[PDB]
Design an enzyme around this catalytic site. Sequence first.
Site, mmCIF file in Angstrom:
data_model
loop_
_atom_site.group_PDB
_atom_site.id
_atom_site.type_symbol
_atom_site.label_atom_id
_atom_site.label_comp_id
_atom_site.label_asym_id
_atom_site.label_seq_id
_atom_site.Cartn_x
_atom_site.Cartn_y
_atom_site.Cartn_z
ATOM 1 N N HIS A 1 -45.824 2.778 -15.152
ATOM 2 C CA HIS A 1 -44.599 1.866 -15.351
ATOM 3 C C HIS A 1 -43.417 2.842 -15.290
ATOM 4 C CE1 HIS A 1 -47.304 -1.578 -17.356
ATOM 5 N NE2 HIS A 1 -47.337 -1.363 -16.242
ATOM 6 N N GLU B 1 -53.087 -2.640 -16.766
ATOM 7 C CA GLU B 1 -52.731 -3.802 -17.212
ATOM 8 C C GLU B 1 -52.753 -5.034 -16.297
ATOM 9 O OE1 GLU B 1 -48.982 -2.745 -19.503
ATOM 10 O OE2 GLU B 1 -50.548 -3.116 -21.077
ATOM 11 N N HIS C 1 -50.206 3.515 -18.964
ATOM 12 C CA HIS C 1 -51.500 2.794 -19.793
ATOM 13 C C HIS C 1 -52.647 3.287 -19.214
ATOM 14 C CE1 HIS C 1 -48.462 -0.171 -21.768
ATOM 15 N NE2 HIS C 1 -47.942 0.088 -20.414
ATOM 16 N N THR D 1 -44.784 -5.751 -21.704
ATOM 17 C CA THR D 1 -46.277 -5.750 -21.965
ATOM 18 C C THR D 1 -46.521 -5.393 -23.461
ATOM 19 O OG1 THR D 1 -46.951 -3.872 -21.077
ATOM 20 C CG2 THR D 1 -46.890 -5.652 -19.540
ATOM 21 N N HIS E 1 -44.021 5.593 -18.445
ATOM 22 C CA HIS E 1 -45.069 5.743 -19.269
ATOM 23 C C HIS E 1 -46.180 5.350 -18.692
ATOM 24 C CE1 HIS E 1 -43.444 1.679 -19.929
ATOM 25 N NE2 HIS E 1 -44.761 1.511 -20.227
ATOM 26 N N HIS F 1 -47.891 4.769 -29.213
ATOM 27 C CA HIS F 1 -48.443 3.645 -28.314
ATOM 28 C C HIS F 1 -48.716 4.321 -26.694
ATOM 29 C CE1 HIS F 1 -47.242 1.024 -31.399
ATOM 30 N NE2 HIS F 1 -45.980 1.642 -31.365
HETATM 31 C C1 LIG Z 1 -35.647 2.418 -25.559
HETATM 32 S S1 LIG Z 1 -37.253 1.643 -25.724
HETATM 33 C C2 LIG Z 1 -38.100 1.194 -24.008
HETATM 34 S S2 LIG Z 1 -37.751 1.920 -22.701
HETATM 35 N N1 LIG Z 1 -38.662 1.125 -21.793
HETATM 36 N N2 LIG Z 1 -39.338 0.410 -22.493
HETATM 37 C C3 LIG Z 1 -38.981 0.090 -23.880
HETATM 38 N N3 LIG Z 1 -39.642 -0.425 -24.455
HETATM 39 C C4 LIG Z 1 -40.495 -0.841 -23.553
HETATM 40 C C5 LIG Z 1 -41.800 -1.700 -23.917
HETATM 41 C C6 LIG Z 1 -42.640 -2.115 -22.832
HETATM 42 C C7 LIG Z 1 -42.457 -1.568 -21.538
HETATM 43 S S3 LIG Z 1 -43.583 -2.103 -20.243
HETATM 44 N N4 LIG Z 1 -45.271 -1.848 -20.545
HETATM 45 O O1 LIG Z 1 -43.163 -1.297 -18.936
HETATM 46 O O2 LIG Z 1 -43.282 -3.667 -20.024
HETATM 47 C C8 LIG Z 1 -41.435 -0.824 -21.397
HETATM 48 C C9 LIG Z 1 -40.413 -0.440 -22.450
HETATM 49 ZN ZN LIG Z 2 -45.853 -0.245 -19.582
#
Ligand SMILES: CSC1=S=Nn2c1nc1ccc(S(N)(=O)=O)cc12
Ligand SMILES: [Zn+2]
Length: 257
Positions: free
Chosen positions: A116, A103, A93, A195, A91, A61
């Site tokens: 993020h 986003e 986007h 998100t 990470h 992703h």
């Molecule tokens: C250990 S899985 C993990 S750790 N940080 N995140 C995780 N899943 C996520 C799903 C979404 C996001 S987001 N795009 O920052 O809202 C951050 C996430």
């Molecule tokens: Zn994110």
Amino acid sequence: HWGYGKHNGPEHWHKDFPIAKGERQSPVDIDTHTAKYDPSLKPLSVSYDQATSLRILNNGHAFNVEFDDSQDKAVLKGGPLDGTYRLIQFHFHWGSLDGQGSEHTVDKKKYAAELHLVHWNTKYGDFGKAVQQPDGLAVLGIFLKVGSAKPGLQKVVDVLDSIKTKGKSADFTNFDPRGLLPESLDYWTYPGSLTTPPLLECVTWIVLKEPISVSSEQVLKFRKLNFNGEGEPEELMVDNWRPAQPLKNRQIKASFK
Ligand SMILES: CSC1=S=Nn2c1nc1ccc(S(N)(=O)=O)cc12
Ligand SMILES: [Zn+2]
Ligand code: NA
């Protein structure tokens, strides 16, 4: 099954994750003029001096840089937060073109990408428990525009060819996330969600007003990654962003101006 295609993209997520149509979904458009200045909001405290990066991972992703979150090594506090929040990963986007990829939007403007930095409230002991709480996460969002290079980003960009496809990972130590921050810590804040699925409504969003600049070559390297696994046919990892969702009964607050 979920992803960012015509048949599994954001418009389809509600079928597996009904909270997609919830009351506090992210991202949102930030209307800079109707954001409420709050003089009682504290400056944001970013303490990343002792950060320990561990690994970088293509999860199909995005790519994630993971940190040791077993101690208070890299923490977010202050700002709108009452707790101490531990950095678990960051990470991005990004888009297929420089004109899209973020986003959050600012007065409907889309940036080339969005970083993020994901943090969880230490009172809940781990990430898995934190996501089940309305004050479980604090995600620091930073916009990327295309212009001059960000030298602090280059170590990330250079390792991407080793994690081209879904499931691939690589050692990634001694990365300093302070090299990804803009000069100003002025921010907007609002209550929102993850998100991506599971879209849990557990996030205090803190979005920095000042974007960082990255070069065209840096963002081009993001776009060479693959959504697919090594065995599978090539789908370039681009446009892995969710569009703005309805603000509903929420106010965005500003720390500035
Ligand atoms: C250990 S899985 C993990 S750790 N940080 N995140 C995780 N899943 C996520 C799903 C979404 C996001 S987001 N795009 O920052 O809202 C951050 C996430
Ligand atoms: Zn994110
Ligand atoms: Na996909």
